């Protein structure tokens, strides 16, 4: 039993809710919140900008030190950093950004990072400003993640479309 509330169950292990991931993280305090990161951990907009703003820029400060030490992530890769006031940990995962021409097949590799964590609060990878089709992202999620994932979809119209079209 966990504290996630109001989710629709899609499969054995995948759940979905129309929610603001920032507000959801603030209420649940999950062990892991996933950020929709880029390789430079520059949290300027989308989910990343929202999560970073909610940490009063502490996420960005920590991220800049991470990059200065380790260099950029790979597209499809991830790193674990602090969850600050939102979660115990933040799993920064880099989905391909279609608006940069990155290969969509890397979306499966990106979701594989979730399997290293038993339970996660997450957005749909490569959705929003990353330019992928969220219906496709949900399908890859369901077919790749085996651990327990609670998906927050900010846009109510999109949430209803994802549910109604789910196979
Ligand atoms: O859901 S969508 O709009 C349709 C694709 C987008 C995915 N992005 C998100 N997914 C979940 N929670 C979220 N909270 C946010 C706060 C912001 F300021 C900007 C984006 C988000 C967001």
UniProtKB/Swiss-Prot annotation:
Subcellular location: Host endoplasmic reticulum membrane
Known partners and oligomeric status: May form homohexamers. Interacts with N protein.
Biological role: Responsible for the cleavages located at the N-terminus of the replicase polyprotein. Participates together with nsp4 in the assembly of virally-induced cytoplasmic double-membrane vesicles necessary for viral replication. Antagonizes innate immune induction of type I interferon by blocking the phosphorylation, dimerization and subsequent nuclear translocation of host IRF3. Also prevents host NF-kappa-B signaling. In addition, PL-PRO possesses a deubiquitinating/deISGylating activity and processes both 'Lys-48'- and 'Lys-63'-linked polyubiquitin chains from cellular substrates.
Membrane disposition: Multi-pass membrane protein
Catalyzed reactions: Thiol-dependent hydrolysis of ester, thioester, amide, peptide and isopeptide bonds formed by the C-terminal Gly of ubiquitin (a 76-residue protein attached to proteins as an intracellular targeting signal)
Protein name: Papain-like protease nsp3
Residues of the full protein shown: 1025 to 1191 of 7096
Regulation of its activity: Inhibited in vitro by GRL-0617.
Domain Macro: 1-167
Gene that encodes it: rep
């Amino acid at each position: 039993v966990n504290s996630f509330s109001g989710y629709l169950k899609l499969t054995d292990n995948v759940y979905i809710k129309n929610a603001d991931i920032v507000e959801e993280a603030k209420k649940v305090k999950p062990t892991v919140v996933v950020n929709a990161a880029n390789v430079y951990l520059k949290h300027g907009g989308g989910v990343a900008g929202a999560l970073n703003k909610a940490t009063n820029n502490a996420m960005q400060v920590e991220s800049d030190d991470y990059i200065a030490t380790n260099g950029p992530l790979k597209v499809g890769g991830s790193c674990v950093l602090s969850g600050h006031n939102l979660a115990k940990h933040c799993l920064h995962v880099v989905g391909p950004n279609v608006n940069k021409g990155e290969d969509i097949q890397l979306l499966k590799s990106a979701y594989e990072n979730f399997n290293q964590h038993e339970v996660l609060l997450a957005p749909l990878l490569s959705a929003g400003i990353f330019g992928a089709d969220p219906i496709h992202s949900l399908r890859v999620c369901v077919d790749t993640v085996r651990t327990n994932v609670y998906l927050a979809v900010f846009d109510k119209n999109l949430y209803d479309k994802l549910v109604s079209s789910f196979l």
